[PDB]
Amino acid sequence: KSVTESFAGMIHGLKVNHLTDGIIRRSKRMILDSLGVGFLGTGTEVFHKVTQYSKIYSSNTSSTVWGRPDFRLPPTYAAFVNGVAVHSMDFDDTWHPATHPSGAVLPVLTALSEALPQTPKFSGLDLLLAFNVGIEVQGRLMHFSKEAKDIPKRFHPPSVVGTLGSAAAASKFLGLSLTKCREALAIAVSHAGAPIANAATQTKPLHIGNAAKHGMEATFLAMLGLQGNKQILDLGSGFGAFYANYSPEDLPSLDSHIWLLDQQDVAFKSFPAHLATHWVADAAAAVRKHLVTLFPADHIERIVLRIPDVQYVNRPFPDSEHEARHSFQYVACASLLDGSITVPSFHSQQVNRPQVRELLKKVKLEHPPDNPPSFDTLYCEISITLKDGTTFTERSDTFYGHWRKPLSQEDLRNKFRANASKMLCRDTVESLITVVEKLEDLEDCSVLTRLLK
Amino acid sequence: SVTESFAGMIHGLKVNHLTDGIIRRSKRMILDSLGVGFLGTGTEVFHKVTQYSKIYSSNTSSTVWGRPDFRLPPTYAAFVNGVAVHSMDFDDTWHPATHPSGAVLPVLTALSEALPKFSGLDLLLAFNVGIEVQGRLMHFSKEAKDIPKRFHPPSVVGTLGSAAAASKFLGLSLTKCREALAIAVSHAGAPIANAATQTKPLHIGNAAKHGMEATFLAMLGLQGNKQILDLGSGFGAFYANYSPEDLPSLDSHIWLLDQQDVAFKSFPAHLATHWVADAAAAVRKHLVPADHIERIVLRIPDVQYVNRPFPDSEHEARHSFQYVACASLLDGSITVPSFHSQQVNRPQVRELLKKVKLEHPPDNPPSFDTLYCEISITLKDGTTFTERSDTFYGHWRKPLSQEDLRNKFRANASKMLCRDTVESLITVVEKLEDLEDCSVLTRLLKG
């Protein structure tokens, strides 16, 4: 047969009986983190704009807009705005090969659980199964091109593999047949193109939104019988259009299948910025220990960041939240000036402080050959020379939260608490934590969705 | 920057910049698009996209061309109407390769209805702005001159052209036009493989839809990359060897449509097969005998997604060099019903399809501007006949006359509309220049 048919086979064939306790732990962590960052993102300008746009549409079915119990959107637009919320602050999870896999799946399954209830109630295990199918389809697909393991320079993966992950999760959750799962994937491929250039702008979050949206839309068109190319995932003129040196492979038998999450964990972010800057901040946080026992900003000779050549996060003078989130230089100098980087660190009011500008003017980037542009092998080394000639240097190979040194469950819960506390009552936050941690045992998925408002 | 140059051109151009040529050609393009859309509203693809779209409703709405019994939001109205226009791949063709009219006209129509007076000149201005933007974008990559092999141009340049036309028609500021383009870029990716199947029409639909959506998001103030058209990591992500250039100053600007006409199709198939049919129609003149032929050799470029020696369905038949050749030989002509399943899988067609050999000489590159088709038929007794078509009637080198294009419109639109309504549409489009309000044209689409 074909690789495309293999993907349809994996989506259709996988059952709750194939889920492992490891992927269930990782899935519950991913879901809790995604909900927290979404709730936080509901306060952004981007989420406001996408909800003001979406509100003009209405349907016979509708779904919750996270944190805002006063209005509902069609399931498509609800998933759209919720994915925007999770990716509104570049604060959701990161995986390897490079993508942001949770934001494109969870809002879709939530909207479907509300919008299209099955005659048998949806269970937490059904949500986990569809979630892991989407997470598996993306990533399993990314291993068909080596460049997917590097930080992207052409297309933004969450719009490419995230869209097909959405389609796979929706097809699984609703219960589509083998060939309709295939057709949902083939249709989603024609909704999957978006460039990396918009990463530093107000548009970037919509890459998750549409990824959540379009996949669902493809599934709907697949249910109506709309057909696509039977070999869309193993043609260079099909899905392979998004990757250089595309090299697809058949999927393994379910008897020999191993979930990707059981072998490759996700990284969780501590502050809302590009993952590469999490190395920068860490290195900066170390070197500041030799300078501060307030930072002596008035008399610093220079700041040197040894960091790989990722141009779209090379921003010596960012103006907005979004540019600061994609700025090596701002993250380094802000960590040096304040002593830590958190959410308010990326407010444009804070980014444009005169101390930030004067210290920022001193930041030099250096790209040594030994460190490649990849979240798995990237490092950051920071050197600060004083006007008196003294030079200090510290290096970060792995930061707390990276898949090599993951956040503890307590720290991930506390991130969730701090984020959700702007939208949810305390008791709602604690109950939602409980429900997600015990999601595998949840007889009725409604319990989770009813807490998102 | 080039991006700012596009925003400048879109905002700056006025009705007074419209030329006699681009108006004549725009009226031809619009009439053809309406006819082919009405024809396409009877297809399964239109059914699928309207059964999907009907679930959405908004404060404003717009006409569904073949189904006046309900209304859609202008977004979904443009979606399904563009689908109808591209439902059987019988839209027009332009150079560099794209299908620029199908992605633009439904958007301007839905906007004139949903979000009100717009004049025929305002419609023509926004339409030509979209067409111009598509042309200028395609001139930034060499492969745009060729028949596509990775992305489907109407989903890439058509999306930004739609966004430009919508932004122009609604009246967005300079920077909001720029932002509409930057947002549209993030909605613009679709591969050529789905060209050979039932999904293909949606590439126009989404191109009409997403462009409009981008404009709406721009109107709300959503920002994108201000130099999206100057980055290979931006719009250039869709092209090999992307090399953008500034647009000429309005002091020296020339419309592209005024220099490069569009080709109009005679039968619903990929434009390349229009060479094949023409050549085939010639060679049978020396024969008119399906059972007396040794072989059929069809010289034609290496375009794999129209290389289907044994098609299964409607969509493969529309993308089959071999089927077009064999149907032309058997019937003497190709018409719309020629692509029905019972006509594709008939035994005479199969007996000839088994005989078709393709040859790809260097003289044939995969490009609509330099393509030719040469067909040779050898009989079992050794007799060989050869005929060649370098340009077919309807190609921009031999464009369809007004009589033939009007008759195409009549034949197609009459499937859905009362023929007197068809004549009224002929007059209104022919006289669009003097039309006080677009309402007159859109009312005729109620029928």
Author numbering:
A (entry chain B): 4 to 296, 301 to 460
B (entry chain A): 5 to 120, 124 to 295, 303 to 461
Give verbatim lines from the article.
The detected asymmetric unit contained two molecules (A and B), which comprise the functional unit of IRG1. Following the refinement and model building process, the model of molecule A was constructed from residues 5 to 463 and the model of molecule B was constructed from residues 4 to 460. The mouse IRG1 structure revealed that it is composed of two distinct domains, a helical domain and lid domain. The helical domain is formed by 270 N-terminal and 80 C-terminal residues, while the lid domain is formed by 140 residues in the middle of mouse IRG1. Interestingly, an unknown electron density was observed in the active site of our IRG1 structure. Structural analysis in this area showed that K152 and D153 from A1 loop formed hydrogen bonds with S381 from A2 loop.
The IRG1 protein, also known as CAD, is over-expressed during immune responses and catalyzes the production of itaconate, which functions as an immunometabolite possessing antibacterial, antiviral, and immunoregulatory activities. In mammalian systems, itaconate production is catalyzed by immune responsive gene 1 (IRG1), which is known as an LPS-inducible protein highly expressed during the inflammation phase of pathogen infection. Itaconate, the decarboxylated product of cis-aconitate (an intermediate metabolite in the TCA cycle), is a small immunometabolite that can control innate immunity and possesses antibacterial and antiviral activity. Our findings indicate that IRG1 exist as a dimer in solution.
